[PDB]
Amino acid sequence: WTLEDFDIGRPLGKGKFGNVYLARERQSKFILALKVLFKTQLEKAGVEHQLRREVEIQSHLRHPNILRLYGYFHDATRVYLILEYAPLGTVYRELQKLSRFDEQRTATYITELANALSYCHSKRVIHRDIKPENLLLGSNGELKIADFGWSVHTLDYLPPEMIDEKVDLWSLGVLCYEFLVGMPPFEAHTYQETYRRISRVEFTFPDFVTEGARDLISRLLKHNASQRLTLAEVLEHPWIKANSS
Template sequence: MANSIRKMALNEDGLFRIDDFEFGRPLGKGAFGIVYLARLKKTKFICALKMLHKSKINEYSMAEQVKIETESGYKLNHPLILTMYDVFHDEKRFYFILEYAPHGQLYRFLQKLRRFTDRLAASYIYQICHALEYCHSKSIIHRDLKPENILVDCCGNLKLADFGWSTKIRHADTMNTTACGTLDYLAPEIVGHKQYQYQVDNWCVGVLAYELLSGHAPFEGTDDETKVKIANINYSFPDYFSQPARKFIDNLLQKDPKKTYAT
């Protein structure tokens, strides 16, 4: 993918420079940078350009995560995962050239509709499970699944995005202990500072399914309250949740990761 898009660069070496792009509106902003709608001057190719400030990355010791995000982007090639075309950098920033998903975050759809029907939620969960299954087959754990990190393309299909907190399992028996992700979506083993593996993504699918069907996460509260609720698997269903939805979510939100449904 990188080799083919590098033909669109203006430079003889085939490497991108920031001057190769025309910038449109900002698409999103994070702690380490910003994402812009962009267009390559040479071919008018539309993309999203994610810009990360090196000063911020160094300040928070995130260089290793940027490396992993880059490796994950080059390795993953799936229709339900946002394509990373290439990465380049200059003295001040890293730049990720990404596929543009024109309908933006799934979170915005959820805010507009307040909650999804069983049919729509099931369709979205099905797509995310396929994307995660592929990630896991490539030994990658996403670790930050949430509606804000799921984008919607021009056809209404989902694109799993933002691998900034992802990690790679080097060996089948390798376990992680790094606490990261979004609090409402953290698995009990992360909250409890225990070792974990792929099952933390499966837990997130359960939280996501609950949020898509209700409009809010199952363990909402203050930070301390949320941690206690997660540790004790303390949640309840609104009356309108169907029995199949309850069973699916219950089988994912398990305290013992070995009992969690595989995606």
């Protein structure tokens, strides 16, 4: 694989480590995405080895709710990822467009994360970076989890033990709240305020969040990590079963 193999389209997203572009294989016509990472930024942040970890992890993961990495290669000062293209964009963009999600879309996305994270954990992978800007939408509106850079084998999304696998469960409950409310639950003006609220698990619901949702989120956002609700318990949760497509 080399740059020569691809036609590049429009920018899909700007990241701090690199840019995403829509692309087409020249000798397959197949549509895909291409993420350019500059070594400059990788070595100055000391994440070079992490990228090699992501690459090996994404060599083992096949699930309809996980974005595929078909392959990778490097130039002289750039590393390239060849990714499944997600036509309908990020969940983050959609949340900005809609301002908040209804119960049905929220429960459906939460079901799709949980199936996906359940598959990861069964393969001994913890994602650790669950957040709206790393959730993508396929052709049929399907949630796809992307970006396995911080995977192992803002501060708003970190569980208190970060300020094993139960971190994904805290992140999941942060997501569910953010999906319904349009703001993550420990949002504050100062960094110190935000830290204090996370450690204390100090959040409140606006009146429009229903009892079923409050229960789900409360069983997820617990200081004691091992007492958080499991992925199987999330999929079997009454509010999820009632609202999920």
